C-alpha cells in the first residue's frame, strides 16, 4: 500500500538462481519457501507497513499441555519477531497453561475447550497460522510464509513420487485422491493463510469429515488426508519447504536444508 523506504541490499541476479538444487516455484506460480529465496528485510518492511497481526493457534489437550512452555518460549525467540502476534491456546486445562514472558506487541489468549467464535479471528488478526504443539522453534519463521493460503511439505515425502504419497486411496472417502493425481503431500502440522482462507479450508474439511462419518469411513490420516484433498483442488499461494517441519532425530540434517526452523520434540 504505502511506499517502501530507500533500502540498500544486493541486486538480484536474473541469470543467477538463488537455489539450483530445489524447485522454488510451483507450476501454478506459487513460491516454495527455502532459505536463500527471500530477503527478509524487504518482506519485513512490506508487512510492518501494513501493521500485520499474525494469529498462532495451538491445541493442548490432556498430556499435551506439557509441550506449551517450550513451544511458546521458542516461538518468542523465532516466530514473527518484530510483528504483532496473538497466540490462541485451546485447552481443556486453562490453569495448566505456563506463564511465559512475552515480548512487546505480543499477546496470548487461553480458550477453554470441550465445546467452546470464528468472527473473533476476523476482527483480531490478519493471518492465521495453525500448528501442532509438540514442537519447538529452532530458527527464523517469519513473514516470508504469509500469503492467502499455504501448506507445508511433509518431511517424509518431499522427494517421493505421488504414487508413494499416503493420500486416502478409497473412492468412498471425500478425501479420495487417485494415484495419477497430486502435487505434493502436505503435513497437517503447519498450515495457514488469511483468516478468510483458513476458515474456508476448515469449514470444507469439517463438512467432508462429517460426510465420511455418515458413510462409515475414516480417512487414513484423518484431518491431514482432507487437508491434502483441499489443497489439491484449491492450490496454495505459497508452499513451505521441509525447513518448516522437520525431525532431526528421525531424518537428520540433509544438505538441502540450510536451516531447521520448526521441529518435533523428542
Ligand X SMILES: CCCCCCO[C@@H]1O[C@H](CO)[C@H](O)[C@H](N)[C@H]1O[C@@H]1O[C@@H](C)[C@@H](O)[C@@H](O)[C@@H]1O
Pick the piece of the chain touching ligand UDP (CB under 6 A) from 1-9, 24-32, 114-122, 131-139. 131-139
For the chain, helix, strand, coil in percent to 5 are 30, 20, 50
| Residue 247 contacts residue 264 (beta carbons within 8 Å) | yes
| From 189, 219, 231, 245, residue interacting with ligand UDP (rule: CB under 6 A) | 189
How many distinct helices (H) and strands (E) make up the chain? 6, 10
- Name the minimum Å distance from CB 155 to ligand X: 5
264 pairs with which residues across the strands?
135
Q: How far apart are CA 3 and CA 50, in angstroms?
A: 11
Contacts to Hg ion from residues 116-145, by CB under 5 A: 128, 130
Pick the piece of the chain touching ligand UDP (CB under 6 A) from 101-109, 119-127, 130-138, 240-248. 130-138
| Alpha helices by DSSP H, 63-194 | 68-78, 119-124
| From 48, 62, 77, 170, residue interacting with ligand UDP (rule: CB under 6 A) | 62
Query: Of 136, 197, 224, 243, which residue is the catalytic one?
Result: 224
78 known member of a binding site: no
For position 132 contacting Mn ion by CB under 5 A, the verdict is yes
For position 56 contacting ligand UDP by CB under 6 A, the verdict is no
| From 80, 208, 240, 260, residue interacting with Hg ion (rule: CB under 5 A) | 208
Element (H, E) at 135: strand 135-137
Q: How far apart are CA 126 and CA 266, in angstroms?
A: 32
For position 157 contacting ligand UDP by CB under 6 A, the verdict is no
224 is catalytic: yes
The label of the residue with cell 503447519 reads: 190
60 binds, among ligand X, Mn ion, ligand UDP, none (CB under 5 to 8 A by kind): ligand UDP
The C-alpha cell of 186 is what?
502436505
Residue 109 CB neighbours (<10 A): 13
Nearer to ligand UDP, 132 or 144 (CB): 132
| From 83, 106, 154, 226, residue interacting with Hg ion (rule: CB under 5 A) | 226
| Residue 225 contacts residue 187 (beta carbons within 8 Å) | no
For position 224 contacting Mn ion by CB under 5 A, the verdict is no
| From 162, 247, 256, 265, residue interacting with ligand X (rule: CB under 6 A) | 247
Q: How far apart are CA 156 and CA 211, in angstroms?
A: 29
250 binds, among ligand UDP, Mn ion, ligand X, none (CB under 5 to 8 A by kind): ligand X
59 known member of a binding site: yes
Q: What angle do CA 252, 75, 230 make, to 5 degrees?
A: 75
Backbone angles phi, psi at 2, to 5 degrees: -80, 150
| From 90, 156, 232, 256, residue interacting with ligand X (rule: CB under 6 A) | 156
Q: Which residues are catalytic?
A: 224
Q: Which residues bind ligand UDP (CB under 6 A)?
A: 58-62, 64, 132-134, 189
Q: Which residues bind ligand X (CB under 6 A)?
A: 155-156, 166, 187, 221, 224, 245-247, 250, 264
Amino acid at each position: 500500500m504505502v511506499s517502501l523506504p530507500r533500502m540498500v541490499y544486493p541486486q538480484p541476479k536474473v541469470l543467477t538462481p538463488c537455489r539450483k538444487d530445489v524447485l522454488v516455484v510451483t507450476p501454478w506460480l506459487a513460491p516454495i519457501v527455502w532459505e536463500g529465496t527471500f530477503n527478509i528485510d524487504i518482506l519485513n518492511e512490506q508487512f510492518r507497513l501494513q501493521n500485520t497481526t499474525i494469529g498462532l493457534t495451538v491445541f493442548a489437550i490432556k498430556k499435551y499441555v506439557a509441550f506449551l512452555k517450550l513451544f511458546l518460549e521458542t516461538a518468542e525467540k523465532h516466530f514473527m519477531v518484530g510483528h504483532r502476534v496473538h497466540y490462541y491456546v485451546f485447552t481443556d486445562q486453562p490453569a495448566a497453561v505456563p506463564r511465559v514472558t512475552l515480548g512487546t506487541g505480543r499477546q496470548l489468549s487461553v480458550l477453554e475447550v470441550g465445546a467452546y467464535c470464528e468472527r473473533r479471528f476476523l476482527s483480531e488478526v490478519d493471518y492465521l497460522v495453525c500448528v501442532d504443539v509438540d514442537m519447538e522453534f529452532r530458527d527464523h519463521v517469519g513473514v516470508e510464509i504469509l500469503t492467502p493460503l499455504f501448506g507445508t511439505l511433509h518431511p517424509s515425502f518431499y522427494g517421493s513420487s505421488r504414487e508413494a504419497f499416503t493420500y486416502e486411496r478409497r473412492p468412498q472417502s471425500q478425501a479420495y485422491i487417485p494415484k495419477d493425481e497430486g502435487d505434493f503431500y502436505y503435513m497437517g502440522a503447519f498450515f495457514g493463510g488469511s483468516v478468510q482462507e483458513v476458515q474456508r479450508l476448515t469449514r470444507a474439511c469439517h463438512q467432508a469429515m462429517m460426510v465420511d462419518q455418515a458413510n462409515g469411513i475414516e480417512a487414513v490420516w484423518h484431518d491431514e488426508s482432507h487437508l491434502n484433498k483441499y489443497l489439491l483442488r484449491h492450490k496454495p499461494t505459497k508452499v513451505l519447504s521441509p525447513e518448516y517441519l522437520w525431525d532431526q532425530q528421525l531424518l537428520g540434517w540433509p544438505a538441502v536444508l540450510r536451516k531447521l526452523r520448526f521441529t518435533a520434540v523428542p
